Amino acid sequence: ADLEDNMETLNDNLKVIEKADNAAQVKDALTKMAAAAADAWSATPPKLEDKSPDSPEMHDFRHGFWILIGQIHDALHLANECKVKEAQAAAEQLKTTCNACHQKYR
Amino acid sequence: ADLEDNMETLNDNLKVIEKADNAAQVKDALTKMAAAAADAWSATPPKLEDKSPDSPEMHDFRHGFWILIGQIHDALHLANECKVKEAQAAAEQLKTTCNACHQKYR
Amino acid sequence: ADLEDNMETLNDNLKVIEKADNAAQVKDALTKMAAAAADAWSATPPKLEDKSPDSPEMHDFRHGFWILIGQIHDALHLANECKVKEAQAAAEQLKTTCNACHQKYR
Amino acid sequence: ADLEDNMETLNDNLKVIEKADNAAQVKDALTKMAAAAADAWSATPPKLEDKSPDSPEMHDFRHGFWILIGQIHDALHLANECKVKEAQAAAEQLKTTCNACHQKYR
Ligand code: HEM
Ligand code: HEM
Ligand code: HEM
Ligand code: HEM
Ligand SMILES: *[C@@H]1CC(=O)N(C)C1=O
Ligand SMILES: *[C@@H]1CC(=O)N(C)C1=O
Ligand SMILES: *[C@H]1CC(=O)N(C)C1=O
Ligand SMILES: *[C@H]1CC(=O)N(C)C1=O
Ligand SMILES: [Zn+2]
Ligand SMILES: [Zn+2]
Ligand SMILES: [Zn+2]
Ligand SMILES: [Zn+2]
Ligand SMILES: [Zn+2]
DSSP, X not given: OOSTTTHHHHHHHXXXXXXXXXXXXXXXXXXXXXXXXXXXXXXXXXXXXXXXXXXXXXXXXXXXHHHHHHHHHHHHHHHHTTOHHHHHHHHHTTHHHHHHHHHHHO | OOHHHHHHHHHHHHHHHHHOSSHHHHHHHHHHHHHHHHHHTTXXXXXXXXXXXXXXXXXXXXXXXXXXXXXXXXXXXXXXXXXXXXXXXXXXXXXXXXXXXXXXXX | OOXXXXXXXXXXXXXXXXXXXXXXXXXXXXXXXXXXXXXXXXOOOGGGXXXXXXXXXXXXXXXXXXXXXXXXXXXXXXXXTTOHHHHHHHHHHTHHHHHHHHHHHO | OOHHHHHHHHHHXXXXXXXXXXXXXHHHHHHHHHHHHHHHTTOOOGGGSSSOTTSHHHHHHHHHHHHHXXXXXXXXXXXXXXXHXXXXXXXXXXXXXXXXXXXXXX
């Protein structure tokens, strides 16, 4: 799929987690973020369109995705453990990653 | 790509790493494995086509990939650190992950 | 050592990364953060002394430490890859972890 | 404890996981492994008695503990999710880590 709406998927579901009442809602939302993050692994962003995929800045662009994927993995465990406020915070802390990569590659 | 290809991608580069003389070959190989593992995230394996995408086996199916992704991530760091032998061992260790998921959903 | 003293160690070093010129200052600093973070895995914080180690809340208190350990582990790879500004950024992010646990347990 | 005592803690708890019947015994055991792994972080092995604890040779010895800590954190998540067989498998796999570090530093 596209990076935007891979990014939209991530962003919508992030708010869903923010407004959630319950675990079920969070589990479903995190799973959707997992799909969009993994599916975004391929993409070449607009800033980086001519740079080589095997390029030092593509390597750093993807790394940020490993970070995100790892942070979503763990938050899903917390959700699965029905530690909701805890999943919710891990999601909030997961924001930096979004931010660090935005500042640099967008 | 096809679940099948991705598995072939992982497999093939696994041997490339087992065989490698220097860092560059290991890095390139790992990176390919990363692409295949991430791309495979959304696949529904043949043994589970009946069972829903939100089902318990599917979550456990997907979890296994989270583990692979994390292990590839770290090995690439070791490769980047020119610690080749160590990278090659981290690869060999991974094989368990491949095998835990094969025993179960294969 | 002391929980207080480890916190100090984490902080002091955190700043040393902030004012870094080179990777070596960063690697050394992170390695110490690692020692402090691991060494504090044990500690019972003041607000929790009445609570059993095996309490749901000393399970979350410790969880936070795993997050920090993981984050440092990864920043050290970045540093070891002489990816210095990048390592610096990973350090900036991991503050969230310091703050999530402060707001709750401190 | 001294490296030896933590290694025994690790070893003993691993059989306990091995023979377990219910989640509770697995979690209690993994939590102990966590303490022993974190508490070992600082130990110098004996074949490194001389080598300064900023050698890259120390750095590599500890790296292995970052790997163990991470694999324990997870297997605890699995256990906390009452996914007991899955937790048990995650412990068996994580030995490779035990085995790798024994081979090199022991
Ligand atoms: C973190 C979980 C995260 C969020 C949230 C997020 C959101 C987001 C939006 C809303 C856009 C705009 C898309 C549009 O078409 O309107 C956007 C764009 C980009 N993102 Fe992002 N994004 C998050 C995480 C990450 C991470 C970890 C990275 C890189 C490692 C990343 C990258 C990008 C890039 C590059 C863009 C530019 C897209 C474009 O304008 O074409 N995002 N993101
Ligand atoms: C580890 C990196 C890994 C390797 C290597 C690997 C290889 C592999 C092969 C060669 C096949 C056969 C496909 C073919 O037709 O040639 C195969 C098949 C499946 N596997 Fe696999 N695989 C690795 C890892 C993993 C992981 C982490 C999982 C589960 C999370 C997994 C699972 C599967 C499944 C399902 C198949 C069947 C594919 C199909 O025919 O649809 N593997 N793998
Ligand atoms: C991140 C790596 C991190 C930093 C930095 C940090 C700093 C810190 C400070 C500055 C203090 C006290 C400072 C003051 O009094 O002005 C302090 C003390 C406590 N901390 Fe902390 N800390 C970091 C990480 C973490 C994490 C991840 C946790 C929880 C898992 C945590 C918790 C605490 C607690 C409790 C205290 C109070 C200690 C006491 O007085 O006994 N910190 N830390
Ligand atoms: C994995 C969790 C793990 C286990 C289990 C383990 C066990 C273990 C034993 C049983 C000994 C010998 C003690 C006896 O009386 O039988 C031993 C010794 C050492 N270990 Fe270990 N070990 C595990 C993991 C690891 C890891 C990941 C490392 C390094 C990163 C490591 C290191 C060592 C070292 C060094 C020794 C020598 C100390 C000694 O017993 O003389 N172990 N371990
Ligand atoms: C998580 C989901 C559920 O039903 N419980 C009781 C949990 O703890
Ligand atoms: C460091 C290690 C290596 O193999 N190369 C090519 C480096 O630059
Ligand atoms: C370590 C130092 C450096 O310049 N590189 C590229 C490293 O991996
Ligand atoms: C499922 C697994 C567990 O430990 N509890 C308390 C559950 O409800
Ligand atoms: Zn769109
Ligand atoms: Zn966790
Ligand atoms: Zn590592
Ligand atoms: Zn990394
Ligand atoms: Zn997990």
